[PDB]
């Protein structure tokens, strides 16, 4: 993993501050704060208010989240600035206390991206619980890319992208803080997720890698969305957050905990909102920014993807 | 149910012809033909070649399909003109014989729409197998609609649309030929589909209505793609295509056919392709047409949706 000073943000702090919100407190004056990083095509609340915003206070946390505009569709590198600035603001705001990070979809990729390239936060993140993270991107972005209607982050979340290439080559496919990766082979957004090994997009070396079909058998279907919200996903999440290691333990979950439908501690209205998590996201994408090339890598990550083709051309040293 | 003459086509006869194709046979020479009508944001091949085009061949039928431009995102009334000219083709081109019709998503709605408003084809359609059809549309089109980024047919597949309204009021929520409707409650595109009753968007009166949870239990998850692709879906689809009573019944399928994953009879390649059926479709919508209103109903259907607003305004006598 890289080292030295933290690279400069491309955004002002105030712009990064405005993307961070805690439920019940001020970010820089909070206690027991958890950080929530939303998925592609969502704000923090849109991604989590039907699931982990309530469920995290059910465990004694002040829920906090970022909402990088627009709906996580812009550059993932910029999206990461919101996460890095959040953890730096939340550390001091909670009495220099290490804080947990819970993420969905791109939120995971964002987390590991910051952890890899922004060293100062590694000693400030207690742990990482990532639901359906796409550390290797997804091949399923291909058709979107082929029609040149892909958002900045959608380009970057394609398998073989310059961003994912950079993450791998900088050592980012090995966990940097204690990490738990809940995912599924039936995921209709992220693939490959099937082999239940390091071939999988959600797998980080030295981290707790839970593919659902390995704990509930070949028949068990949960999609990309369910991967975050389902009752199964809750027990794994509850485990990871409370543990003494920083990772979820196999003691806390099993076939009894294998419930595909939305979590049980959700009001019947929240169960419907979670069951339809993908619909607003899909709308945001259809309505969001689109371009015909993957965004340029910032100087800190640029040398890790030499040979790849971004908007400015072939990445060179 | 309306009758008299067939409504005059808006599409040229020759234009409609180019939409139809069969695996091996001419439109005029086809033998044991099945007509396949695809989902929203797809072509015939896209929707089916990973699932029912190859399932039909093993069964005995010569697979055929329409692919209305562009990617089923145009007016559903115009999408239907493709199926009407097609049934007149596969009938006359099979030597004056009835032919089955198998459909996914909007495909079902289109079939039932033609059956409702085009008398001539009622005599020519043997049966109808519809997977996750949306005869009452879906509510999940709302966010797209609210952002005015919805294609013509996406407006029309919205719950409460002038089109779904007209369909109910001309007696189109009753099966016009023998009809089977397989669908899921965990369907993330079309809803509501949960009550296991006539409230469900897939339900037709007098039709064989199979909801997957009403046999596999309230923990069986298949999504909008699964509804077409699963092995479960193969058994029910085969049953209906083999029944002398026009439709499937419970004797042909049971708890041992609760297989959510793609059809076992498909090649590993086809089983991977079928699992990712949605990705091209989504990409087609992102790249597809977009407007801020539901398309005007053609004069043959317009009186059955008095009060509703379309692009030209509110409908009146």
Swiss-Prot record, chains A, B:
Disulfide bonds: 22-64, 216-258, 293-311
Classification via SUPFAM superfamilies: alpha/beta-Hydrolases (SSF53474)
Catalytic activity: a triacylglycerol + H2O = a diacylglycerol + a fatty acid + H(+)
Keywords per UniProt: Cleavage on pair of basic residues, Disulfide bond, Glycoprotein, Hydrolase, Lipid degradation, Lipid metabolism, Signal, Zymogen
EC number of this enzyme: 3.1.1.3
A biological process term (GO) from this entry: lipid catabolic process
EC class of the enzyme, as a word: hydrolase
Glycan attachment residues as annotated in the record: 74
Active-site residues per Swiss-Prot or TrEMBL entry: 105, 187, 224
InterPro entries the record matches: AB_hydrolase_fold, Stereospecific_Lipase
A molecular function (GO) term: triacylglycerol lipase activity
Coiled-coil stretches: none
Protein function: Hydrolysis of triglycerides. Is very stereospecific both in hydrolysis and in organic synthesis and has a potentially important application in glucolipid synthesis.
Stated name of the protein: Lipase B
